[PDB]
Design a protein around this ligand. Sequence first.
Ligand code: 9M3
Length: 261
Amino acid sequence: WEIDPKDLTFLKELGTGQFGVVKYGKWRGQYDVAIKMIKEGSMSEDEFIEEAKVMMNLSHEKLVQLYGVCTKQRPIFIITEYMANGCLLNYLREMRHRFQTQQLLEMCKDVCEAMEYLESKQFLHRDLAARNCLVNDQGVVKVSDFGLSRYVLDDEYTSSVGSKFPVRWSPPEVLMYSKFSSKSDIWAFGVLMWEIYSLGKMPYERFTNSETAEHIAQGLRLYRPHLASEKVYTIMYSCWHEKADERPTFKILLSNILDVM
Ligand SMILES: Cc1c(NC(=O)c2ccc(C(C)(C)C)cc2)cccc1-c1nc(N)nc(Nc2ccc(C(=O)N3CCOCC3)cc2)n1
């Protein structure tokens, strides 16, 4: 699990996530790393350290790899695979970068691959979204910060009405009852397809977070984004059934992305 700070060089800043300052530099002198400095009072720190064994062990070429942790200090550091294009949500909106329908389904193919893995390792993301995917040199989309939602302290993020919460990505069984399963993950997956195809547009850009939770109750679905065929769309929409038993698996969603390639 544990990593020696002496092996960490800091070179360039990377901005700020939910758990505060994040940097770029070198592990063991050579390798390229993303370093989260976990701001004080932001993380349920104890619970993290204990359970982080199980996150270390998750390995798929489509998940941003957890290389390991520095707990023998404060601030505590998290050490992850450096993705080079940053946030997927931003790679979508760089106004000077046009895409093709196939490039987009490819990104959905990346994301579906990683969540299939998780689904078989029975492990939940809980904050799947374009903003929490990232992109490497060869433009591959990998899934970032899976399971890490569990450990935020900030009622705006934790509490289902809170300003900072993933309303727009969450099914009703979450919005009402905070009831996460593989299927609440699936719901966010389809929302993320919509994200891809709308070139990073705010879903339900019309309504507030609160107004949304209302309308989702009432059976609002996101419409087909302009760049999506009725084929792709029959895929995302399946993500959004009312009853979570009737949402597909990630294994079915992977089959169906091939079916359409
Ligand atoms: C992951 C990441 C955060 N996020 C978080 O810290 C974070 C933590 C937890 C959550 C949950 C879901 C639990 C609430 C959410 C977010 C923030 C900043 C950089 C990074 C980051 N990580 C990794 N692994 N790689 C990069 N790469 C990168 C970042 C910025 C640039 C950049 O400045 N640019 C220049 C041009 O290219 C794009 C933007 C480039 C690469 N950035």
